[PDB]
Amino acid sequence: TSEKIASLRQEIETYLNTGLLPFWITRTVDKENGGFLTHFDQFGNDSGEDEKSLIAQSRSVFTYSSAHRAGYGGGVLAEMARHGVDYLINNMWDNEHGGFYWMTNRKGEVTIDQKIVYGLSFCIYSLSEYTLATGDPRGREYAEKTFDLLQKYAVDTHYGGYFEMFNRDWTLKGPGAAGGDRKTLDVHMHLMEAYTTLYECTGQEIHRRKLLETIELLVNKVMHPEYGTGIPQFWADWSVAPQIKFDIVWGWDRFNPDGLKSAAEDNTSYGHNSEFAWLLMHALDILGLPYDTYREQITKSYTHAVENGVDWEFGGVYVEGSHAGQVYDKEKEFWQQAEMLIGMLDAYRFLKDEKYLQAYENIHRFVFDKMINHSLGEWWPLMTREGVPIWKHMSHSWKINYHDVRSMIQSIVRLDKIAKG
Template sequence: MKKKFTAWKDELQHHLDKELLPFWLDRLWDEEHGGFLTQWDKDGKDSGVDEKSMLAHFRSIYSLSLAALHGHDHDGRCQSLATKGVHFAIEHYWDEKYGGFYWLFDRKNNVLIDQKITYGHSFVIYALSTYTLAFGDPIGLEYAERVFDLLQVYVVDTNYGGYWTMLNRNWSLCGPGSAGGDRKTLDIHMHLMEAFTALYQASGKEIHRRKLLEIITQIDEKILHPEFKTGIPMFWEDWTIAPHIKFDIIWGWDRFEGEGGEKEHA
């Protein structure tokens, strides 16, 4: 059995170092407009999709940083590409007026959706904190903390606790129902827990530790089913259970095309 595990480990490491990472390192950067291209066909060719998302951009930074953090940046390309991605996002995707990052762009990096979506910003904090942990670049932690501070000012529900889901560009809540402004979700809080964990690792600040412990408590006491300990998807403001609905803007809804779903902005 030990030999099998060793063989599997070697196979996975070969795939990561020789196939998976090189695939993305060779294709990720948009040489024409800057930013990351993240949609390819089954043959590894550019799909031509005229969209770039904040979410895919920062998930790419996270993946490159995590690979380096665990010793897989053998030629420095992960660091180089992650650094380009961080500085590009700050220059082109950051909202200079209200703070935070816009949600969706066209291929030329023009803003298509300017909403401030908590789900996306959880990955911003996660990615930038991991980037600083991997490479020591303080700008990652600086912007991770700036986003964290914005969430504490605009997204925390000071009445019942927890974090709202969908906000407008100026950080006002979106409308109710499918607009998402009247709901709290399991998804948001689980990803914020990940984000705050990485942020505390990078900063060591007590406020980040305290907010991490706070969200763990909220998940345990509010979100997990009291009997079955499974996650409950959606809640109203006061943490009573809300119907599980599809938001107007949701990542990955195009996965359900052909199964009765209709493509939404990811």
């Protein structure tokens, strides 16, 4: 109903303004050392890590630029984004070899100088969003330099796609855990995300062309050929590779002991598949192309997520399960909820089936009633199926505010479109 949509939008708006953005505004700007503080425990207090990761600093720039562009934050977020861009350029850019370093310490010294394409994707995305939000040409300048370095050093001109981890001097890393011989969904999907906003910013043909090439790589090489669901890791020739952990990580390793088929490699992520599909719809909007350009793919992604991933009984989306439809891990992790909020709304907009709005409300009620720590404003990172926290730190080097603020802003916008339609 229109009354229901209005209630859901109000709930998001009040929380985003009074809860989520103040958690960050009151804590994060580091005026002594530059950049952003992001290590907060279950009480919102500094947990002390001597880290300013490329992921944390760039995601922060993305959140404050995009939220400012959307009218949120009381006007203060453009200057917070500028503070972060100062740190990215002055402390994280390699003035000898180009590209941004993977890790600094809290004082701003480089401690991991590798060139990691997952991080560089987030640099392109955040810095393009920053120029769009502020007009400061530095964002586009360094986004374009990073794009150009990826074309030179990372694109595989024979098989297509990208090699993904390099030493500081852009020599390719070794095989296996060192990261130099796999091509992955995580990197290729986030490059589509980043190139969308790069093209929004520049309007240049090359960015349009290579955004479309990246979409084609994902649809034709990364997604399962029958099921349309994301497969995580490939060899350079785009045959499927055994899944391995890399030396360089950007999340915590959760093992659910009750998870099923823990050795199987037919696993796929409902959250990632929803994220891919709504980011693909956003790309098509920026490209001026109809969603039915990729009707089959978008339908496969969303159908599999709603048919298997949504916990109708307790609320929220499961972690992972098989391509063919068996759920493996029913824990509730934060970022997949965020990406299902946006994706289920866009599935309703394009596919028009009421199950997708039923799924949206299920996810939304889970996030508000179980996952948000309303005492502080941030989201619990990992919960039991029923919604009891498992891990309780609010934020760290890999959990900042990229998924949650974006899901709040993009859900309130899509709900408005649904109400108006």
